[PDB]
Amino acid sequence: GTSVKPIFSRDMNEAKRRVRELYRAWYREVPNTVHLFQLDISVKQGRDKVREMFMKNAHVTDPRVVDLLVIKGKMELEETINVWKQRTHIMRFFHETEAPRPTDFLSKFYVGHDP
Amino acid sequence: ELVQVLRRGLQQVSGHGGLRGYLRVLFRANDVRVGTLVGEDKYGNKYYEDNKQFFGRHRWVIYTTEMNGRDTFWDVDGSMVPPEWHRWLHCMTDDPPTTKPPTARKYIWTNHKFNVSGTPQQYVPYSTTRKKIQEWVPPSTPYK
Amino acid sequence: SRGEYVVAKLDDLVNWARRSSLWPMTFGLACCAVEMMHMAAPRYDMDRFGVVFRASPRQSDVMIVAGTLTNKMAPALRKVYDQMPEPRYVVSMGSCANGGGYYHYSYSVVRGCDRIVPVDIYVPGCPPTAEALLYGILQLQRKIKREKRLRIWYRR
Amino acid sequence: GVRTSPTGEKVTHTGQAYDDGDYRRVRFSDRQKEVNENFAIDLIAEQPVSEVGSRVISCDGGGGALGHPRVYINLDKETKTGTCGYCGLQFRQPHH
Amino acid sequence: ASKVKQDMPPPGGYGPIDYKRNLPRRGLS
Amino acid sequence: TRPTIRPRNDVVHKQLSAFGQYVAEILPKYVQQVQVSCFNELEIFIHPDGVIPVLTFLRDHTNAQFKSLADLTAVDVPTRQNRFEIVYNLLSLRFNSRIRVKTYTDELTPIESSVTVYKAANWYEREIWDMFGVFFANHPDLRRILTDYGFEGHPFRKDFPLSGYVELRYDDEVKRVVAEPVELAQEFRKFDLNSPWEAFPAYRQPPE
Amino acid sequence: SNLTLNFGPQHPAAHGVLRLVMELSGEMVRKCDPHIGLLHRGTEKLIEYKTYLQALPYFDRLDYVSMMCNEQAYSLAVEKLLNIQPPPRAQWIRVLFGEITRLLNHIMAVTTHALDIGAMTPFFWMFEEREKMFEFYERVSGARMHAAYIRPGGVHQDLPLGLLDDIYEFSKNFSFRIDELEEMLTNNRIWRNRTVDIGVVTAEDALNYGFSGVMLRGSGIQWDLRKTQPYDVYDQVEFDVPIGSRGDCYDRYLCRVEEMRQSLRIISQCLNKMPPGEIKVDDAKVSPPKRAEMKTSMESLIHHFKLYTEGYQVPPGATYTAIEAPKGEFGVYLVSDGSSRPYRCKIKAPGFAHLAGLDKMSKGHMLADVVAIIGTQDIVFGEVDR
Amino acid sequence: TYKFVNMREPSMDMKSVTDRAAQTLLWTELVRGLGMTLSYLFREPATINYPFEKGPLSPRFRGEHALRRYPSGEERCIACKLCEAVCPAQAITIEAEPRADGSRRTTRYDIDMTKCIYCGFCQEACPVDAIVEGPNFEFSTETHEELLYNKEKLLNNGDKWEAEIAANIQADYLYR
Amino acid sequence: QLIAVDEKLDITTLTGVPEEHIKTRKVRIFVPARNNMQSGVNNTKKWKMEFDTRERWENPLMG
Amino acid sequence: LHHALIPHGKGGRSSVSGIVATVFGATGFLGRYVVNHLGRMGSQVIVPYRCEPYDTMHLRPMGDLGQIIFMEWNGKDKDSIRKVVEHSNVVINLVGREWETKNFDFEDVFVKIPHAIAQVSKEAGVEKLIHISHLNADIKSPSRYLRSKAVGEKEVRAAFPEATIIKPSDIFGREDRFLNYFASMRWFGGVPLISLGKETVKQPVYIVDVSKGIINAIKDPDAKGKTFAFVGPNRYLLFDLVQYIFAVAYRPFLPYPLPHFAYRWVGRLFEVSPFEPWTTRDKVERVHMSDMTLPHLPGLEDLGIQATPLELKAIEVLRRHRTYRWLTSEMEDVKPAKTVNI
Ligand SMILES: CCCCCCCCCCCCCCCCC[C@@H](O)O[C@H](CO[C@H](O)CCCCCCCCCCCCCCC)COP(=O)(O)OCC[N+](C)(C)C
Ligand SMILES: NC(=O)C1=CN([C@@H]2O[C@H](COP(=O)(O)OP(=O)(O)OC[C@H]3O[C@@H](n4cnc5c(N)ncnc54)[C@H](OP(=O)(O)O)[C@@H]3O)[C@@H](O)[C@H]2O)C=CC1
Ligand SMILES: C=C(C)[C@H]1Cc2c(ccc3c2O[C@@H]2COc4cc(OC)c(OC)cc4[C@@H]2C3=O)O1
Ligand code: SF4
Ligand code: SF4
Ligand code: SF4
Ligand SMILES: [Zn+2]
């Protein structure tokens, strides 16, 4: 029951199919992105980052949430392909000027009060 | 006629105190008009009017060549005008400070300062409040 | 020394030429640009100081940031700043450009354009009047007059 | 009422002067420190106390609408003077 | 007992203001 | 009651009430509520499934003729199970009138795009999607319109912080503009202004 | 492949921070994609964190060429929600300054349109007049453009003791300046070639796309909000509404010039009909009292304190208030939850719909024609992005 | 009530046709435009000789902020914080404590001039005319830090501009 | 058409909040106490959600 | 720690790191990166400059409001050094010129100035001093640059016993002369190399690695009196290195041997330029001298830095040196050069 209306997919199988299609499109786009934006990363780095972004949301079990995630990923792909994005936008995925924040207890205790 | 305009030009060069004063005003303000001296400044600026000029060109100041410490023969700016002549010059009032002096207070600056930005006299912001948390001072004597 | 006198005179000549021909990029972001227009309007006539607008960043000496700089716009401002040949100057005009102003606490506003580019003159106001912007421009000319590139080269 | 700290820095009306080991003093080197020289606490301490022949006096700071809101000051205590909470002027009844 | 003084139009009215387009003919045949 | 109080208009109030009754009778399938505000502003609450029929009827009916869409926006009310309130404002030139149509949705439920009914909606629906995250089905070209490229989240939502999560600055080492977690030199100072005494008795709620 | 071109934001013809992505075959425009948001400042969220008086200066900065018209729309919305009424003298002042503001906006629009086209001269002639009107703004409020004079209770201050005379002196010379502008532009064959039959929009399309103002009237639609849904004292003034015939850029230019003339007419009427009285609603729980009262009376001081710290509370409810701003219908959807802060403020700007229709209006045109169309839509991106 | 801007039909008589042919071939309206520009060439320009000549201003003009005093030299500000509450830009920062003589005075009074929108709401809100927007507008700085005003800077502005500020207030306070 | 989703509602991956501000945060849901300086009770009618207090420090400039 | 100097915040732009640093030589190649890394964390940075203030403009956006303070200084003046190090707990020295000017020889910039800085900062109570010398610093080296570096290193150690001395080797980056010098040679036609560059081994180090190493050495309590050597992860023969540089730039590589005396004569001819020389005799000696191996000194991995290989960052320096034809070529297309490691 729970009486919900879908966006595109009726169960997780169709949602997974759409996820795979979007992943294929991003995988094909990465080399062109590296060429056009004149990025100093490799194609391997770009595809690894695409996989990491996809795996960030691997725990989702709602087909509607997956449909919205695919819609957002398609929005980002359309944005990248048309060059609406600049090199700064593409490089924002890699956080190159962010100092690594530690995760163990002792370093956090040393730096400050935040957990 | 044209000849009367030329005569106006010659009386304009004659009216600035000779050829060298004419050249001084031309190279100092890029203007050679003659107006009635409304007044002078305690810093040397002179203030003139000419009510026959259109609104905007009917009041002007010939700045001093020597402000507080700096040479202002070429380097002048609008911040050198003191507040009373500032009120008259920007047409906030019709009455000059000579005929309508401002009210006297003992905390008002007796010496106007110009824009001191980019100069060792510039303003540097800082916190004006005192310390909030006081730390414990350990005793100066050994504990054993 | 004769060499020091020569470099001082050449220094003065180059500074005079540079400050007497200040070409700002035709570039406006928001409300402040309107007052910029009023500085070119007949009453103030910036052209009489040798100050003429030119659209191309390659033919520009000064960038006037006249308006809010949002996050979406910051890369473009940085890009057209980088395409200015040197020497180049930036005049920050208005509260928005100076520090964010009315939109300082926004998710989409850069809190001051000096985070993106180096700024020479900060013109306060919201908007600054055309006269205040003219005062800032004349202030930039004085700043340029104080340059001594050739003297520093000679002493080094 | 200006006065310098042992470091040579002027002390403001607020009383804040950077400590000897405070690095922030570096912001004044090659520049100056803005200090207003007319201390209000000292200037208001010079005004003469006004003597009035009534128990309750009124103060509006002078200038009518150019002063502060008008307040009424009781003057029954003879060990002290009635002080305006807006302007700082002092009032008393003729005593002794 | 001062009377109310306020920015108002003068008694009667302000002089008429032209607003219609005025483009003369100004030519030969 | 005369000089400083806004005057009333009962004729327009009656006309709007009658027309609201008209609309409700014609479309019982979707119309849930009809209201006439005190300053004569007709409001019609409907079911989401009736977005396209209602608007179509309202713009096409001979007695309606609301051929112009003033604006379309959304309101976020987190306490409601359906978070978002979709508001359409329509103007009729033939009858010199205005009408407001309201519906509801939540984060995961699409609304039918009304570009077919009104061409003006395109950018309005894009803006609602960008600011609130409400998806519109069958929209020609749905994408962000106001926010920066790659911006995460929806700013107009009540939960989103006023200054967001990231800021921008130019970094010389990478020679480009970078996005970093927001740090503020001075924190925005939250004021508590609400008076502890009730202002308007006419709106008092039952004590539950 | 079509050439893909960035038009702006750093472009003279852009008229602000617009990134017009254009697909072109030769110089023919195959597609227009306006990318906006380069001046989105998040104004509506900010307005949510302010009181109703603190949110007023935002409406100055929405459309920076029609400041008081933006203020008036917001003030009307808040007054409708408060169930109060501004005094008659305030309403006459509001209409007078709204017409002065319409003059300012129309000068800016027409001269910047001519400047894009290439006729650079009329700009300098008309900006001196704009300067004098800025002086009028400044005398009344102390600010040249962002005045913040119109408040939800009326106006902030009464006119200074000689302002009407100077407004009269300015108004009796302006028609000749309009005449000189028309001599420059109206009958020039080059201007007509650059404007006639460019950006033609039908009445049906203009209505459906959400157009308003001149973009309607150039296509023959007879609609002016001052006539159909009057506000303040607009029902007491007489003026004609210009109407076009062809729906092109040329017809929109003629409409704006005639609108300028009709604004002169309305100003003349407002000057001769200004009544006496107070300038804000005589209700100290909404409008602040005078300073002498604030310094003499206990109630006046309490109300001054509370109005400037917490602000007045607005009874719960939502309104959509629209005015005939110089660029079209300008609206506010204002939602009050009963407190002194607005719960929601959606701003409707005509430029949003006009720019959304720019792609439609540019079908079958060249690059220069697209520049002319952007000029003829009268776009300011403060109101578009907000 | 409406008029038409482009609904006029041209006459088709031989004289009108010949006049239009002369307009087309001999470029009469272009000479009209040339005449208009030539006319403007011989007018007096509306330019002013800045900085020697200034633009007109008003007593209500909003400029650089200043903190004022009573004629005794005592500060007017009592730290009510109404200016800080009303400021739409949150540009004002205030800290206060009892003075050594028990007076209610500020210990911190900052205005961030790059946050300020120069609206004048603070001088309206001030109940003792302590904070004002003075007449000055020529205070461009070379660094951002110089535009972060503390209490010393604002008191110095008041001391420097009091003569003109009092005269401006005297000319406008009856409209307030 | 209805699809009968069975799982608990979860929108974290769509909100765009950084994960640090999702996992390490604690909210308080409460009816605020009446301000003891006043007798009005109108500020004690609705429920409030607010986040945990984090570090605040002193700006080196201006404090 | 003097409460005002207690770290606060999340280590960002508006935070307080507790560092107050005076960076001599901040207007150079390494100085901009050092100031950027210091201002990222919210440090107070004092920049002494003798150049035209225009030339410091690029350092303005590196800090928050008030966090970067610019002060005029003179290298021959010790009162000026006192003025600029009075309130700092860290002093970094990056002063150095590749060529010798009329008013400053190598011994002035590498012995006198570093010694004066060390003496004055020790007198002023500065807690930490970081000095930069070269990896190849030596008392009897053929280059007077390196002889002066070694003498100045000893002088600094004598004047500030707890100073951290860092010895990098051929920093490469966007504004680095070493990467640029090879690129510059293409205009002439042929690349002149002594012995065809087959008898020289280089171990270049990335600029960001050196800046991070300096920053970490500041925050390291046990790095006080240590001496570090900052070298890259790979060693190349000069021939292979220049060949890789020319392959990344997509320029035709035409190497030819040039005898030592001819190259010295060319350097002397280029030395008479009143402006910045294209090359000098000292530069010729330093280019064809193999990088030393110092396994007994702590390295970047002792400061927590993982050295960046040149293969990963060469394109960001050399894409500017390409023609339009090869401007979009990807990074992994150039077949990394041959390393002579052990
Ligand atoms: C073969 C020659 C080749 C080179 C030729 C170059 C062109 C010829 C030289 C032209 C010189 C003209 C510039 C000097 C004009 C000075 C004007 C004067 O007003 O400047 C003052 C300052 O003068 C400058 O400091 C010095 C100017 C001259 C500098 C030295 C010139 C030496 C020339 C040597 C030429 C050598 C050429 C070698 C290569 C050929 C300050 O004025 P300023 O404050 O702005 O005014 C603001 C406006 N106010 C006044 C109304 C407020
Ligand atoms: N490959 C490399 O770059 C590595 C560099 N070396 C050492 O590392 C340090 C930094 O190197 P790098 O940044 O590349 O060199 P740069 O030439 O780029 O910068 C040198 C700095 O020192 C200043 N300076 C130079 N001479 C003087 C002087 N006589 N008086 C005052 N200041 C002066 C410069 O100021 P100004 O611009 O005004 O002249 C400048 O800021 C230097 O000590 C260098 O010797 C270590 C191994 C190699
Ligand atoms: C060149 C002269 C004589 C004037 C005209 C002018 C400037 C400077 C800048 C600009 C400009 O006009 C163009 C086109 O019209 C607007 C309209 C704008 O809003 C009304 C706006 O705000 C950013 C910007 C612009 C352009 C702009 O940047 O000086
Ligand atoms: S500073 Fe004020 S006038 Fe200038 S762009 Fe910002 S809001 Fe508009
Ligand atoms: S003028 Fe307005 S923005 Fe500026 S300090 Fe006063 S209230 Fe705040
Ligand atoms: S300046 Fe005026 S409003 Fe502000 S705290 Fe002082 S007395 Fe109160
Ligand atoms: Zn008193």
Burial class (CB in 10 A: 0-12, 13-18, 19+), J128: buried
Ligand nearest to the CA of D86: 7
Q: What is the DSSP letter of H75?
A: B
CA G331/CA G320 separation, integer angstroms? 7
H126: Cβ–Cβ under 8 A, 6 or more apart, which residues?
H77, H82, H83, H132
Q: How many domains does chain C have?
A: 1
Confirm if J113 and J91 have CB atoms less than 8 A apart: no
Q: Do G238 and H1 touch (CB under 8 A)?
A: yes
Residue of chain A whose Cα is closest to the Cα of G33 = A84
Q: Which residues of G touch C125 (CB under 8 A)?
A: none
Ligand nearest to the CA of D73: 7
CATH code of the domain containing H148:
3.30.70.3270
Cα dihedral B41, B46, B47, B49, rounded to 10, equals 160
CA J129/CA J114 separation, integer angstroms? 11
Is residue H66 in contact with ligand 5, taking CB distance under 6 Å? no
Confirm if J33 and J176 have CB atoms less than 8 A apart: no
F36: Cβ–Cβ under 8 A, 6 or more apart, which residues?
F13, F16, F17, F20, F42, F43
For chain J, the residues whose C-beta falls within 8 A of a C-beta of chain B are 3, 66
- Give bridge partners of residue F166 from the DSSP assignment: F181
Q: Do A97 and J9 touch (CB under 8 A)?
A: no
Token pair for G359: 């792609």
Antiparallel, parallel or unpaired: β H131-133 and H65-67: antiparallel
Q: Which residues of I touch A4 (CB under 8 A)?
A: 2-5
Confirm if B57 and H49 have CB atoms less than 8 A apart: yes
- Give bridge partners of residue G320 from the DSSP assignment: G333
CA D79/CA B142 separation, integer angstroms? 51
Query: At residue B54, what is the residue type?
Result: F
Name the residue with the closest Cα to ligand 6, atom 6: H77
Token pair for J32: 């901009």
Is H23 assigned to a binding site? no
Among residues H86, C126, F188, which one has the least CA distance to residue G51?
Answer: H86
Name the residue with the closest Cα to ligand 6, atom 2: H126
In this complex, which of B56, B78, B118 lies closest to C143 when CB atoms are compared? B118
Residue of chain C whose Cα is closest to the Cα of H147 = C124
CA H82/CA H127 separation, integer angstroms? 8
Residue of chain D whose Cα is closest to the Cα of B127 = D16
- Give bridge partners of residue J257 from the DSSP assignment: J193
Kindly state the helix (H) or strand (E) to which residue F62 belongs, with its residue range: none
Query: At residue I56, what is the residue type?
Result: R
**Chains with 3 or more CB pairs under 8 A to chain A:** F, G, I, J
Ligand 3 mutation pick, G7, G10, G11, G15, max ligand atoms within 8 A of CB: G15
Q: What is the DSSP letter of H176?
A: -
F147/C contact by beta carbon, under 8 A: yes
Q: Which residues of B touch D33 (CB under 8 A)?
A: 124, 126
Q: DSSP labels for D67-79?
A: S---EEEE---SS
Q: Do I61 and H110 touch (CB under 8 A)?
A: no
Q: Do D31 and B128 touch (CB under 8 A)?
A: no
Backbone angles phi, psi at I31, to 5 degrees: -90, 120
Ligand nearest to the CA of B72: 1
Residue with tokens 């301490």: D45
CA G375/CA G112 separation, integer angstroms? 7
Cα–Cα distances (Å) from C19 to C37, C137, C147, in that order, read 21, 10, 11
Q: Which residues of B touch D42 (CB under 8 A)?
A: none
Spatial strand order of the sheet with C121-123 comes to C62-66, C89-93, C121-123
Q: Which residues of G touch D65 (CB under 8 A)?
A: 291-292, 295
Antiparallel, parallel or unpaired: β F111-112 and F136-137: parallel
Please confirm whether the linkage preceding C87 is cis (ω < 30° from 0).
Answer: yes
Residues with their C more than 2.5 Å from the N of the next written residue in chain F, i.e. before a break, are: none
Task: Give residue ranges with CB within 6 A of ligand 3.
Answer: C 26, 28-29, 33-34, 36-37, 40, 53; G 12, 15-16, 65, 108, 112, 123, 380
Q: DSSP labels for G222-280?
A: ---HHHHS--TTGGGS---EEE-SS-SHHHHHHHHHHHHHHHHHHHHHHHHT---S-SB
CA G348/CA G332 separation, integer angstroms? 6
**Chains with 3 or more CB pairs under 8 A to chain D:** B, G, H, J
G264: Cβ–Cβ under 8 A, 6 or more apart, which residues?
E17, E19, G103, G171, G174, G175, G178
How remote is the CA of residue H105 from the centroid of ligand 6, in Å? 10
CA H138/CA C121 separation, integer angstroms? 12
Confirm if J122 and J160 have CB atoms less than 8 A apart: yes
Confirm if J174 and F175 have CB atoms less than 8 A apart: yes
Q: Which residues of D touch H160 (CB under 8 A)?
A: none
Three-state secondary structure along G97-162?
HHHHHHHHHHHHHHHHHHHHHCCCHHHHHHHHHHHHHHHHHHHHHCCCCCCCCEECCEECCCCCCC
Name the residue with the closest Cα to ligand 3, atom 14: G15
To the nearest whole angstrom, how far is the Cα of B141 from the nearest Cα of chain J?
A: 21
Please, which experimental method was used? cryo-EM
Kindly state the helix (H) or strand (E) to which residue H126 belongs, with its residue range: none
Among residues G338, G284, G280, G288, which one has the least CA distance to residue G308?
Answer: G288
Among residues B30, C107, B75, C16, which one has the least CA distance to residue F184?
Answer: C107
Among residues D87, B134, B127, D37, which one has the least CA distance to residue H107?
Answer: B127
Q: Which residues of G touch A82 (CB under 8 A)?
A: 21
Largest CA distance in chain H: 99
To the nearest whole angstrom, how far is the Cα of A83 from the nearest Cα of chain F?
A: 10
Confirm if G23 and G4 have CB atoms less than 8 A apart: yes
Ligand nearest to the CA of J32: 2
The total of other beta-carbon atoms located within 10 Å of residue B101's CB is 11
How remote is the CA of residue J176 from the centroid of ligand 2, in Å? 11
Confirm if F100 and F43 have CB atoms less than 8 A apart: yes
H helix runs in chain A, sequence order: 12-36, 43-55, 63-81, 87-91, 105-111
To the nearest whole angstrom, how far is the Cα of D39 from the nearest Cα of chain J?
A: 28
What's the gap between Cα B126 and its chain centre?
Answer: 28
CA B28/CA B16 separation, integer angstroms? 13
Q: What is the sign, positive or negative, of the torsion defined by CA atoms of J177, J183, J186, J190?
A: positive
Among residues G197, G195, G199, which one has the least CA distance to residue G209?
Answer: G199
Ligand nearest to the CA of D44: 7
The total of other beta-carbon atoms located within 10 Å of residue D69's CB is 19
Q: Do H85 and F186 touch (CB under 8 A)?
A: no
Cα–Cα distances (Å) from C122 to C92, C98, J67, J115, J250, in that order, read 5, 6, 18, 40, 45
Residue of chain B whose Cα is closest to the Cα of D15 = B130
What's the gap between Cα J291 and its chain centre?
Answer: 15
Antiparallel, parallel or unpaired: β J191-193 and J255-257: parallel
Name the residue with the closest Cα to ligand 1, atom 5: C13
Token pair for E7: 């920015």
How remote is the CA of residue H81 from the centroid of ligand 6, in Å? 5
Helices B2-14 and B19-29, packing angle to 10 deg: 90
Q: Do A10 and I1 touch (CB under 8 A)?
A: yes
Burial class (CB in 10 A: 0-12, 13-18, 19+), C51: buried
B83: Cβ–Cβ under 8 A, 6 or more apart, which residues?
B102, B112, H135, H160, H161, H162, H163, H164, H165
CATH code of the domain containing C69:
3.40.50.12280
Q: Which residues of E touch H22 (CB under 8 A)?
A: 29
Q: Do A114 and I55 touch (CB under 8 A)?
A: yes
Confirm if C59 and C92 have CB atoms less than 8 A apart: no
Name the residue with the closest Cα to ligand 4, atom 3: C127
Q: Which domain holds residue C93?
A: 2-155
Among residues C155, C111, C139, which one has the least CA distance to residue C4?
Answer: C155
CA G385/CA G9 separation, integer angstroms? 14
CA J175/CA J171 separation, integer angstroms? 10
Token pair for C43: 């009453």
**Chains with 3 or more CB pairs under 8 A to chain E:** G, H
Antiparallel, parallel or unpaired: β G3-7 and G19-25: antiparallel
Confirm if G350 and G330 have CB atoms less than 8 A apart: yes
CATH code of the domain containing D60:
2.60.260.40
Q: What is the resolution of this structure in A?
A: 2.4
Q: DSSP labels for B109-130?
A: -SS------SSTT-------S-
How remote is the CA of residue B30 from the centroid of ligand 1, in Å? 16
Confirm if C63 and C90 have CB atoms less than 8 A apart: yes
Ligand 3 mutation pick, C31, C37, C48, C73, max ligand atoms within 8 A of CB: C37
Q: Do J50 and C152 touch (CB under 8 A)?
A: yes
To the nearest whole angstrom, how far is the Cα of G112 from the nearest Cα of chain F?
A: 25
Domain ranges of chain A: 1-115
Antiparallel, parallel or unpaired: β J205-206 and J171-172: parallel
How remote is the CA of residue D84 from the centroid of ligand 7, in Å? 5
